[PDB]
Ligand binder design. Structure first.
Ligand SMILES: NCCNC(=O)C1=CN(c2ncnc3[nH]ccc23)CCS1
Lengths: 20, 405
């Protein structure tokens, strides 16, 4: 569900990491 | 994995007449004519299963044997880890020895490059990190843990750290060069992994997490970007930037938003259970082709995660949804891998009953997908990157905060 929403989210490429 | 003695509630090496006494006891507790709570019926068959084995003296023989062997494998693994843990490898090479070819990927830490050692003639993969982008993060710590841990661990699915050294501008980690590409690229290209396809990958992670947890190590950054496919089509975990050795609870907020377990997002502390949460996300993203929790921006991903409302696609078997429902559990007293039966709850799940655990470890199962090997040192299962030359300054930067390397 919402695969086209996944593409619209802009978070489909290699995701960077949080480090806090 | 099955733990027959715990089902009956007895110590190993109990007397066969206490095995009989234990069985008739637990059998009365979960009897269908006596207890009707929905879980009792399957603990009843599991109590019968434990007795069928422990009373047949030749089957208690095979089971007691496979157990001491596990005890020795865990004790020899732990032995290997601690000696290399406290006696780590340093300055085992120098950049002059390696000829740089192609950038295989680029990350916030630094670059990973295909290199050929000139003497040995072998190909390796070098991770270059700039001490000046990392002394700023204040996560010198996370990169020190990555060196100490990667040297000192051994498993068919962890990548092997052959050489490590440092110069004035950077730190270097040379590693076995996995050529099949990142799972990330394959998954995105296809869009989806088939359920049997995902199960294969999932199983090696359960085995790796079992290993790594047995050593009191949390891995803390499971994602397809961090999983590489070797030539036998199997999995090489390749990024340990966030792995820490932990007793009790730890508190750093780190890893990758989509894969952060709820308890990390909340100021509450956390432990190895977060890697089991991540596995559920990993299985989900492989089967669906998208993670269970996205949004334009991390804060709204954190919000979707803590809600614990998941939606599954129309495909997705019933056992898949039951497994993720147990992995993606906000309740730490209900999430598989954290319960009394530990990894067995995952190993013995209905979505896995078709998977030969030992054959996975010995890599004797045929892999649902083998990459096209094009000859030693091909880089075409990797994307092409803009090549930035290595600069070393006249002066050694951050010589102190990276004393241990
Ligand atoms: N999110 C950061 C995690 N990414 C990585 O570690 C990468 C490693 N790459 C490797 N390619 C081939 N062989 C290899 N051996 C060890 C690493 C390695 C590809 C580039 S990205």
């Amino acid at each position: 569900t919402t695969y086209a929403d996944f593409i619209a989210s802009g978070r489909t490429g290699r995701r960077n990491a949080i480090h806090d | 994995g099955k733990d027959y003695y715990q089902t009956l509630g007895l110590a190993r090496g109990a007397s066969d007449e206490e095995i009989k006494r234990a069985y008739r006891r637990q059998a009365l507790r979960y009897h269908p004519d006596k207890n009707k709570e929905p879980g009792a019926e399957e603990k009843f068959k599991e109590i019968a299963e434990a007795y069928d084995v422990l009373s047949d003296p030749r089957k208690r023989e095979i089971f007691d044997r496979y157990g001491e062997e596990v005890k020795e494998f865990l004790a020899k693994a732990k032995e290997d880890f601690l000696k290399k843990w406290e006696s780590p490898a340093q300055n085992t090479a120098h950049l002059d020895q390696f000829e740089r070819i192609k950038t295989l990927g680029t990350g916030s830490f630094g670059r990973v490059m295909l290199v050929k050692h000139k003497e040995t003639g072998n190909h390796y993969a070098m991770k270059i990190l700039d001490k000046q982008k990392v002394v700023k993060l204040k996560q010198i710590e996370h990169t020190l843990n990555e060196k100490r841990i990667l040297q000192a661990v051994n498993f068919p699915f962890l990548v092997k750290l052959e050489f490590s050294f440092k110069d004035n501008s950077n730190l270097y980690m040379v590693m076995e060069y996995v050529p099949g590409g990142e799972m990330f690229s394959h998954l995105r290209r296809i869009g989806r992994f088939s359920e049997p396809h995902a199960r294969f990958y999932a199983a090696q992670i359960v085995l790796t997490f079992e290993y790594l947890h047995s050593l009191d190590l949390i891995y803390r950054d499971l994602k397809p970007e961090n999983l590489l496919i070797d030539q036998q089509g199997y999995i090489q975990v390749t990024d340990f930037g966030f792995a820490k050795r932990v007793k009790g609870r730890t508190w750093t907020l780190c890893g990758t938003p989509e894969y952060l377990a709820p308890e990390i997002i909340l100021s509450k502390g956390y432990n190895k259970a977060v890697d089991w949460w991540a596995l559920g996300v990993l299985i989900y993203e492989m089967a669906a082709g998208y993670p269970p929790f996205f949004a334009d921006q991390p804060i709204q991903i954190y919000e979707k995660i803590v809600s614990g409302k998941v939606r599954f696609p129309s495909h997705f078997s019933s056992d898949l949804k039951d497994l993720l429902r147990n992995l993606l559990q906000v309740d730490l007293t209900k999430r598989f891998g954290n319960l009394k039966n530990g990894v067995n709850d995952i190993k013995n799940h209905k979505w896995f009953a078709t998977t030969d655990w030992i054959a996975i470890y010995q890599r004797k199962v045929e892999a649902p997908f083998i990459p096209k090997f094009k000859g030693p040192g091909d880089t075409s299962n990797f994307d092409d990157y803009e090549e930035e030359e290595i600069r070393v300054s006249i002066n050694e930067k951050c010589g102190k905060e990276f004393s241990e390397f």
